[PDB]
Amino acid sequence: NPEDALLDSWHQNAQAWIDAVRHGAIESRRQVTDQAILLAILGRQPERVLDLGCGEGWLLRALADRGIEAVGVDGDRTLVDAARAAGAGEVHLASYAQLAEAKVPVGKDYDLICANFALLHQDIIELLSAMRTLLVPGGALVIQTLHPWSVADGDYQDGWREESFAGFAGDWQPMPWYFRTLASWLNALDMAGLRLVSLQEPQHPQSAVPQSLLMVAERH
């Protein structure tokens, strides 16, 4: 099951990930994407935010620093533990499969749910539908993801791929991930009962290609 292999790669890569993210090894993040998601969230003035696939918690901390109550959830223990050791906030351990079935309590009545480069699997509709249920009326899901066109690599078609982490400092195990087209993302949002209200393509002033695709979708 490539979805189980995906989460398993995170268990193997968690430490390398903490080091990369915190030490500032990922140029796209510090130059464009961290700010892009932060500004998209702050723009909605949420009071309660759930960070889905929060990893080691950099976004939980950035939101706490601005007075926002942020709750995190992630499926990897090393990342969850690191997020908790780095801050005062609530971080839950849960897999997406558990969340899709509402099997793990992670709070509810969220103004906003964010997923920052955290939805890399194939069957995401049930998870997204589960997240909708956790939103207050008029709440929003904010997703930042790899830009489909920038990472198409000559094959613009939905399908499994493998990331070797060749450019990253540290030692990594390959990660299987599901590539999806723009149309496929928007279909998923729609099938999950979410309406796209904003689409941005964050891009550094000196870059020729966008660094990510950032979408905001509302409950209804």
156 among annotated binding-site residues: no
Kindly state whether residue 201 participates in binding a copy of itself, applying the rule CB under 8 A: yes
Choose between 87 and 193: whose C-beta lies nearer to a copy of itself. Answer: 193
29 among annotated binding-site residues: yes
Kindly state whether residue 200 participates in binding a copy of itself, applying the rule CB under 8 A: yes
Choose between 29 and 219: whose C-beta lies nearer to ligand SAH. Answer: 29
In this structure, are strands 48-52 and 110-116 parallel, antiparallel, or unpaired? parallel
110 among annotated binding-site residues: no
Residues contributing to the site for ligand SAH (CB under 6 A): 6-7, 10, 21, 53-55, 58-59, 74-76, 79, 95-96, 116-118
Q: Which amino acid is at 189?
A: L
Strands (E), the chain: 48-52, 69-74, 91-93, 110-116, 135-145, 159-163, 175-179, 194-200, 213-219
Size of the site for a copy of itself (CB under 8 A): 18
Q: Which residues inside 163-182 make contact with a copy of itself, applying CB under 8 A?
A: 181-182
Q: Which long-range contacts (CB under 8 A, 24 or more apart) does 120-123 make?
A: 120/6, 120/175, 120/177, 120/178, 121/2, 121/3, 121/6, 121/96, 121/177, 121/178, 122/2, 122/3, 122/160, 122/178, 123/3
The CB-of-137 to ligand SAH minimum distance in angstroms stands at 25
Cβ 36 vs Cβ 63: under 8 Å: no
116 among annotated binding-site residues: yes
Choosing among ligand SAH, a copy of itself, none, which partner's interface includes residue 183 (Cβ < 5 to 8 Å by kind)? a copy of itself
Kindly state whether residue 138 participates in binding a copy of itself, applying the rule CB under 8 A: no
For 163, the token pair is 């990331």
Tokens 């398993």 found at: 8
The CB-of-54 to ligand SAH minimum distance in angstroms stands at 5
Interacting residues of 15 by C-beta distance below 8 A, sequence separation 6+: 78, 170
Q: Which of 15, 95, 129, 203 binds a copy of itself (CB under 8 A)?
A: 203
Tokens 């990369």 found at: 20
Q: Which H helix or E strand runs over 164?
A: none
58 among annotated binding-site residues: yes
Tell me the residue nearest to ligand SAH as measured from the CB.
75
Q: Which amino acid is at 56?
A: E
Q: Which of 24, 67, 137, 154 binds a copy of itself (CB under 8 A)?
A: 154
Applying CB under 8 A, the span of 6-14, 22-30, 101-109, 151-159 interacting with a copy of itself comes to 151-159
Annotated binding site for S-adenosyl-L-homocysteine: 29, 58, 74, 96, 116
